[PDB]
């Protein structure tokens, strides 16, 4: 079987329009993957300890210590938008559809190849690559999800984003329990705080091996591996955004006085004393019915502490925020809303002809207004009594704990039974698509890394590796790691991701926002005279929708 | 499958005579194609700007600037008469048949082979070619015609014309929108005219990729690719020519005086005063019924401006002419009729044992008389009144715009509702056979490059390419283009083109014109003592037919 | 010859003498294969006389043009392509709170490139022979009939059997939608007022 | 109008297919190409001529 | 009508509201309206 | 209304209705009227008006 192909390369995106404005979107993607043999054939238990950085008072946030198990296997991950759609497809989806559903997924490996490097050490010296028609590529598909879930998108180590550029997988490794203590401090702080790595707790040790828990497949050149189809069980994702905040819900006040001259500087007027109006309020001790005072059904969005690090058994970590963008973009407070920032390079969006190790990056700012503008907040004594007196107001300007740079908004939290929020929006092309759910008794209401969370089981991970190619002399009783013939593999990967979407219709007299090419961005969607490419990020929920 | 053939070489032309003088012509052609790996694996957007030539006033016509997208794929094109018929077959068709119909087409690729070059850098140094039995040739067949149509015959880059000489495909590339302005001038012109390349308009950008729009097939040595049969939908092509001009339509004038002595110098005579004749005329203010004045049903052929360049969004271009040959060959005005000129070499007709880059060429002169002889034209005042006075005649000798070298015939146009013309005739062997039709709302009545225009869809293009053969060290994050093992492919191509023709019968007492070998041309159809070949062009429509 | 340095100012190069190239041409007396000389299947768009008024039984009238927009918008010659202009008011698009009888208007410029840029045209003697000599070129700059403001492009017409063009595009919101056809024996291939 | 074109066998008038645009008294029968018919005795001309 | 599909790697031109035209699709404080003209054939297609 | 059918074909139904106001004719007869702005075209070079 050494002389014939076992597959077809396919990277077409098909749109199947069904009855009732429902679209069937089939995303074919295939790639050439290159794989080298492991540096070592054993599992290593390694600890990282950058105490040199955190030993400097006021550097707590740069903590990198952890323990991980380094495995001799590689992970083939394709969970990122860029792997399946090009800017052309994204425009069609984002401008036309109103919601997206994740249906099924499947992959395949074919046309496997294993070559061997012959070191013609002489003259230059030279190298020679020869096919080893009996060598084997090892393939393991963790279908029961025994292994820990490690989504490569998190560290931008997913499959490349160009159908015509070869790619590679990432070495697989997972976390291993450890106990760590780090006490906070600042520049002034005297002495040394407490920076200790206690070790490992016995009741939390879990050493996993692929050999012991998954059936391994041996593929030779004439072999091919296919996965069945997997059907997702997730909630639909909306491609629309809400714009109403608590201030724009319900019946506005009737204006007894209207403008008589064109110009947005000629205002209308309610025309009724603020303390003589009618309506409902949740302030029992006053008669002022203001647009900031009148009652609204519940609350859109919430306030959370910002640049807050909490600590537990293995060190400090940032407190996540699930928020939109409340606040005119020019003003914002991306910390308060927790906008994500993405760093990546060459293989996932950064200009292909660039040089150097500095990544490319961007901070995604959503369209939905479910965020907060802290500087606008304030708290006041119940006696009310305006104008409020300095002693009856806490401003995002008054210091807390004596600190001049810390607010109350800084540790404030207004999440409660009246809180309404929206899920996270897709992020093309660097975003992760789906995510496994936490196996805790009570689950989160959403995840901040991906729009689709598998309610049942997610698709298990696919691990690949080059089987050992031994020489004439091998001795099992040898501390010093043995010898293998330098071997590497090249194989084609192919996958299919099917979504189901719904076509939108016009409902307002005015046009809506739409993605479009133009004089300015034009050259971000075409190659350079040298063949340099790049994939600029786009936004997914242009197009408003009512909230209430 | 590495050890057995997947095909049969066939280059026979079969003629199947059916009932009623209808012939079924099957043209088998097969070739050995050689293919090298791409210089680069990326798509490049390149601009050409020879402003140095056009910067010289009076060189407008040498404008070469344009933008194109260079692809890493190759085009296998067989659309030219020489690929299917030898001079022997062409004589049989041209002398016997009266019309030709294009029925179907199909191709196949078999006995694929991929070798690898080993640079034995030592002593000479030497080279070594080894088979890589796992390497793959990539094949893409654009059946829906998503890609731009680029007929290689246009630049003489079609498949070779000899069954026993290996051939090659051409690198594929297509046009990319650009905006260009060039103001005309002449030697005297002072200053610098205006020669600007504005750039690209966003609303016209179309970047195409084969990977994203066509399924790619991977063939190894034991593999083979076949196309189904494609049936053309075109008008029949006539292998006959008309000779009547407006002057030879209808009933000639009755001669009251006939010659009494043999000799074409002893003329006959109508014998009736020109102003006392009977008949119809379209000159209401005179009584002269002349052979140039009497009425004819309509008009054969038309007058078009010659050596006329028009301009639009991307620069100037020549105004096409669709015309026969009106005018005794010795006299003619090939500019006025727009005779095509063909330049080619070594692989398509030029003497095989020649050396140097100067091509071979010829200007094809048709047999059909549907052309014009400008120097014969003239326009005159309606008062008539002969002999016409200099002030009442515009001659192709009087200057226009003050220019001494410009006529009125030079910008003249007599196309109208009474215009009758014929399609273009085949041109063996360098002519293109079929052509795709423009996708505009109103189509042209004919094309000047090929006799057969597909009314439906034309057969989609076939692209071929060597899949990347990587070495042990490949790094996706590398600006500087990676490294591949030098690989090349050799495969056999085979195609079948079926026409349907109709046998002619004698109808005039006299013999007709026929193609024939003779003392003079004899050696243009045989090899030299060194094995040098050449394929001289022939004409297709010898044999008259009435027009009216 | 391909570019080795990024930048649209780093051009590629055909790399073959213009008189030593291969391909097809419709100029029998020269060996120059240029991008403006090489053969193309037919012709997209056509040239028509501009600001031409013809006369018949009831007075003069403008000669219609059916054309796209050939020419970088900044440059154009809306007369040459015959772009339509629409004047209307209050009830059909003009600002409702406006006053006075002066209508509102606009000249529609299509996206399709089926137009012409006259100043780019030129005609030359068949002997070719470059650089062309003033006596063998008629430029859209040389006067006709002695008039200093009249070209040849001004009365030029390149419509013929190889002409390809497209129909008219919708014009929102002032455009007419449908139209009755002329009751003549031979009909027009299109109308310039409705799609 | 009153255009003669030439080809392989000599010059010939350029045909016109036109109606009559223009108040009859004025016209330009050359411009519209009105046909003229000459005949006699057996096809319309006065028999006793 | 017939729905379109993507065929080129790059995005295509599309009509969209923006900071500049925004107020040509809404009433004035006095109730004044207007209907600005738009173009119909944004989106290229091959000719040949 | 936009009705999406199978195969990407849309059925678009455009309903439009209006209140129309109509006054009686100035006259109940048909008039044959001629317009003659010779005053404008009497100025050489104004043919187009
Ligand atoms: Ca917003
Ligand atoms: Ca002849
Ligand atoms: Ca354009």
UniProtKB/Swiss-Prot annotation, chain D:
Subcellular location: Virion; Host nucleus
Top-rank taxon: Viruses
Signal peptide span: none
The record's note on its domains: The N-terminus of VP1 is sequestered within the mature capsid. It contains a phospholipase A2-like region and nuclear localization signals that might be exposed by capsid modifications during virus entry.
Task of the protein: Capsid protein self-assembles to form an icosahedral capsid with a T=1 symmetry, about 22 nm in diameter, and consisting of 60 copies of two size variants of the capsid proteins, VP1 and VP2, which differ by the presence of an N-terminal extension in the minor protein VP1. The capsid encapsulates the genomic ssDNA. Capsid proteins are responsible for the attachment to host cell receptor TFRC. This attachment induces virion internalization predominantly through clathrin-endocytosis.
Known partners and oligomeric status: Interacts with host TFRC.
Family note: Belongs to the parvoviridae capsid protein family.
Additional observations: The capsids of autonomous parvoviruses expose a proportion of VP2 N-terminus and part of that sequence can be cleaved of to form VP3.
Protein name as catalogued: Capsid protein VP1
Taxon lineage: Viruses, Monodnaviria, Shotokuvirae, Cossaviricota, Quintoviricetes
């Amino acid at each position: 079987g050494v002389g014939i192909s076992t597959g077809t390369f396919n990277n077409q995106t098909e749109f199947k329009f069904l009855e009732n404005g429902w679209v069937y979107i089939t995303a074919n993607s295939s790639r050439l993957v290159h794989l080298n043999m492991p540096e070592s054939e054993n599992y290593r238990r390694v600890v990282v300890n950058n105490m040199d950085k955190t030993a400097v008072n006021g550097n707590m946030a740069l903590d990198d210590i952890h323990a991980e198990i380094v495995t001799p296997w590689s992970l083939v991950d394709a969970n990122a938008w860029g792997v399946w759609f090009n800017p052309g497809d994204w425009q069609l989806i984002v401008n036309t559809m109103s919601e997206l559903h994740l249906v099924s997924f499947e992959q395949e490996i074919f046309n496997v190849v294993l070559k061997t490097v012959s070191e013609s050490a002489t003259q230059p010296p030279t190298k020679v690559y020869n096919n080893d028609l009996t060598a084997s590529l090892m393939v393991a598909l963790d279908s029961n999800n025994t292994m820990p879930f490690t989504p490569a998108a998190m560290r931008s180590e997913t499959l490349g984003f160009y159908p015509w550029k070869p790619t590679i997988p990432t070495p697989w490794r997972y976390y291993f329990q450890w106990d760590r203590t780090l006490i906070p401090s600042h520049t002034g702080t005297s002495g040394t705080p407490t920076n200790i790595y206690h070790g490992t707790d016995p009741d939390d040790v879990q050493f996993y091996t692929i050999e012991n828990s998954v059936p391994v497949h041996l593929l030779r050149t004439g072999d091919e591996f296919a996965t069945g189809t997997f059907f997702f069980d997730c909630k639909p994702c909306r491609l629309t955004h809400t714009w109403q905040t608590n201030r724009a819900l319900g019946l506005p006040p009737f204006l007894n006085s209207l403008p008589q001259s064109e110009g947005d500087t000629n205002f209308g007027d309610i025309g009724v004393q603020q303390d003589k109006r009618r309506g409902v309020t949740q302030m029992g001790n006053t008669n002022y019915i203001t647009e900031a005072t009148i009652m609204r059904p519940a609350e859109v969005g919430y306030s959370a502490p910002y640049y807050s690090f909490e600590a537990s058994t293995q060190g400090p970590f940032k407190t996540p925020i699930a928020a939109g963008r409340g606040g005119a973009q020019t003003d914002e407070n991306q910390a308060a809303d927790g906008n994500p920032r993405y760093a990546f390079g060459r293989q996932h969006g950064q200009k292909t002809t660039t040089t150097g190790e500095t990544p490319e990056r961007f901070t995604y700012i959503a369209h939905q207004d479910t965020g907060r503008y802290p500087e606008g907040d304030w708290i006041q004594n119940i006696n009310f009594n305006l104008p409020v007196t300095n002693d009856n107001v806490l401003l995002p300007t008054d210091p807390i704990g004596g600190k001049t740079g810390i607010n109350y908004t800084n540790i404030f939290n207004t999440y409660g039974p009246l809180t309404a929020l929206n899920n996270v929006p897709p992020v093309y092309p660097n975003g992760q698509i789906w995510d496994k759910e936490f196996d805790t008794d009570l689950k989160p209401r959403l995840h901040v890394n991906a729009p689709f969370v598998c309610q049942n089981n997610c698709p298990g991970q696919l691990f690949v590796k080059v089987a050992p190619n031994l020489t004439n002399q091998y001795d099992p009783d040898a501390s010093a790691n043995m010898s293998r013939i330098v071997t590497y593999s090249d194989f084609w990967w192919k996958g299919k991701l099917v979504f189901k979407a719904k076509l939108r219709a016009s409902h307002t007299w005015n046009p809506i926002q739409q993605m479009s090419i133009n004089v300015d961005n034009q050259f971000n969607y075409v190659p350079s005279n040298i063949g340099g490419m790049k994939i600029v990020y786009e936004k997914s929920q242009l197009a408003p929708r009512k909230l209430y």
